[PDB]
Design a protein around this ligand. Sequence first.
Ligand SMILES: O=C(Nc1ccc(F)cc1)C1(C(=O)Nc2ccc(Oc3ccnc(Nc4ccccc4)n3)c(F)c2)CC1
Length: 285
Amino acid sequence: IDLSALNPELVQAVQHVVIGPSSLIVHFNEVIGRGHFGCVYHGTLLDNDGKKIHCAVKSLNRITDIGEVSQFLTEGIIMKDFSHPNVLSLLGICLRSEGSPLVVLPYMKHGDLRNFIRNETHNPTVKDLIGFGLQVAKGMKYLASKKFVHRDLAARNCMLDEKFTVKVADFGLARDMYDKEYYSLPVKWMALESLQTQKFTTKSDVWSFGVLLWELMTRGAPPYPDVNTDITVYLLQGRRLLQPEYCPDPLYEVMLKCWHPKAEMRPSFSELVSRISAIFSTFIG
Ligand SMILES: O=C(Nc1ccc(F)cc1)C1(C(=O)Nc2ccc(Oc3ccnc(Nc4ccccc4)n3)c(F)c2)CC1
């Protein structure tokens, strides 16, 4: 890539988080995932004392289009100041003389939250699953305070580390693989007004958060499984996702608030953290 062709403010932001190529070993044989535009590898990052850091290394598959390269770098820069225990952080960006720039992320042992809760070899309790939802709300409360709108909040895009801490993220692996849940947009997670206008706000992130809570309470069931990505007509008939069998009544009430037909009337993520903290606290385990 020719750095001189990129936006100079973007390049300057990249240089503030640059990783020198000799500090990063990309394990090209160890693929975490691959889609149409991107690929993710395991990597080893060496810090100044020689400590080895297990990381995920994201690359583009092609670097010929300046728009794609700029957008890819911009995605990394957007997260460089995210500093919160429930938001994925950026280790840095490795610029190489040949090939794609590399976006370097701390490695998340348990992958994405959706596949984690779907894995029958794990046995999270109802309280544990509510806790995951509380952690997402805390990360979203932080992001909303920065006026950041996520636009694709869903269990598939959040990560889980080795301590089972949820990191809100925009993994986008299913998106980049053209997963069925994206239609032309993640319509089964979208607020009614975004289905109609394709505009997104923090209050439409709240709608998506309600769907994510439903994902947690069903251990990763697909929402509206007998509805094709028809969802706008379906909702306007007067419908919502049904209450999962093990979803507490107050948490379903929270879901229905998240899906209020008026975006202005949906609870803030600050309110959601408070309410879900209380519900979580009623469980012994
Ligand atoms: O998240 C992003 N932006 C953002 C962040 C916060 C936020 F609030 C809003 C948006 C971006 C991004 O590229 N994310 C990304 C997320 C995970 C990735 O894969 C990772 C990473 C770390 N460990 C694993 N492990 C793993 C293990 C087993 C199975 C599967 C995965 N995969 C990856 F390569 C990239 C656009 C920049």
